[PDB]
Amino acid sequence: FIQMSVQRIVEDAPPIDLQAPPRYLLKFEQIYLSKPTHWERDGAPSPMMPNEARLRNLTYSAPLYVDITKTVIKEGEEQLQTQHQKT
């Protein structure tokens, strides 16, 4: 599920098309997971161990990031493709 099916669910999603005109495209390309981490109230990441998750009533979860290419066309016959890495 993690290695293949998630990436396929992302890849087969239709890209998002928006209008007012200014056309906007969104496409999701690549998928990333880190090891299960935890941010305290300071927002500081640290590796979370499963015993900590059992003890502190947390969820042994890993954050998920995606690379997103937004391609905006302002009906001037030009396409600006801006990429957000690891969203």
Binding site: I2, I31, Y32, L33, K35, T37, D42
Partner: peptide, 16 residues
Amino acid sequence: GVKLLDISELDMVGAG
């Protein structure tokens, strides 16, 4: 396939 990120590549954007 899904890439792995190390904990050092996690920017501190979750705090901001």
